[PDB]
């Protein structure tokens, strides 16, 4: 609302709203609803078949006050179009309106995408008009109510944009930590366990001292020795790139020598590799109070 319309753009928008109202006549003159003085939309009587500027805001106000906010919205969503151009077949009953063309230029992505916001806006102000009235089955929002009868108002806005580009105005726009028991802290031998990464994001798998804190989060300490399956980097008091990303349906796995001070992480049998030409993910650790499997 608080984007003021320039007057040279106001004459543009009034000509284009005239050439949108000829479509608003033409989609009602095909189905067999004629002009009259009385307002009987179910009985084919419709006094809004006179064009946009010539009808007042007592009959065609639903198409004029819609067009003002829609054209305010035409250069408000980043899809800016200023003054770069000039604003200016079925059988009918006698009035076949043709101010301009429609099948010369088809439109871009953010016009048919902004038509969705226009349909949401119209549905939301209509639902605002449907808030209080009881026995209304329209008491659910735009993103869940049936969106197929709203596609005609998407077609009207998209053909309004077709008229716009005929006139020459285009549109182009926390983390939980998991571990096994403290008493199984292995201090000798050659051990391995496996892990599957399924859905999107941080999978931080490793071996930790039992004195690790799940109070904080992982990797930025000396107790944890881990690798992020996401972003292909390792984690113990810092970062360095290592290996590849995880895949949806991987089996990562982790192996630890304890008599030797080494630790190597795999992926589906492929031993994951560092850019130093060594597949051993962590080396030369302290053989302290043992190490337990941990995943974040």
Distance of CA 276 to the CA centre of its chain: 40
- Dist. CA 36–CA 48, nearest whole Å: 9
Q: CA 69, CA 119: separation in Å to the nearest integer?
A: 12
- Can you name the residues that pair with 225 across neighbouring β-strands? 207
Beta-carbon count within 10 A of 148 CB: 7
Q: Which residue is listed with tokens 């030797």?
A: 260
Residue indicated by tokens 């869940």? 144
- 77 within 8 A of 2, measured Cβ to Cβ: no
Question: In whole angstroms, what is the distance from residue 254 CA to residue 267 CA?
Answer: 9
Radius of gyration of the chain (CA): 33
- Measured in degrees and rounded to the nearest 5, phi and psi for residue 27 equal -80, -5
Count of CB atoms within 10 A of residue 134's CB? Answer: 5
- Cα separation, 284 vs 262, in Å, equals 6
């Amino acid at each position: 609302s608080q984007i003021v319309l320039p007057p040279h753009l106001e004459r543009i928008r009034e000509k284009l709203a005239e050439n949108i109202h000829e479509l608003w006549v033409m989609n009602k003159i095909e189905l067999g609803w004629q002009y009259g003085p009385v307002r009987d939309d179910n009985k084919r009587q419709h006094p809004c078949l006179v064009e946009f500027s010539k009808l007042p805001e007592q009959e065609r106000n639903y198409n004029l006050q819609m067009s003002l906010e829609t054209l305010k919205t035409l250069l408000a969503l980043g899809c800016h179009v200023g003054i770069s151009d000039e604003h200016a077949y079925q059988l009918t009953s006698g009035y076949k309106p043709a101010p301009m063309d429609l099948s010369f230029i088809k439109l871009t992505p953010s016009q048919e995408a902004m038509v969705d916001k226009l349909a949401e806006n119209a549905h939301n102000v209509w639902a605002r008009d449907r808030i209080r009235q009881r026995r209304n089955p329209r008491l659910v929002p735009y993103a869940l109510l049936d969106d197929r009868t709203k596609k005609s108002n998407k077609d009207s806005l998209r053909e309004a944009v077709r008229t716009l580009l005929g006139y020459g105005y285009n549109l182009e726009a926390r983390f939980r930590i998991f571990r096994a028991e403290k008493t199984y802290a292995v201090k000798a031998g050659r051990w391995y366990f496996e892990f599957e990464a399924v859905t999107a994001g941080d999978m931080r798998v490793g071996w930790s001292r039992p004195g690790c804190q799940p109070d904080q989060e992982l990797g930025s300490d000396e107790r944890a020795f881990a690798f992020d399956g996401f972003k292909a980097q390792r984690w113990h008091q810092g970062n360095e790139h290592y290996g590849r990303s995880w895949q949806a349906g991987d089996v990562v796995g982790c192996m630890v020598d304890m008599t030797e001070h080494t630790m190597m992480f795999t992926l589906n049998g492929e031993i994951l590799l560092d850019d130093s030409g060594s597949e051993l993910a962590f080396k030369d650790f302290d053989v302290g109070d043992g190490f337990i499997p941990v995943c974040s």
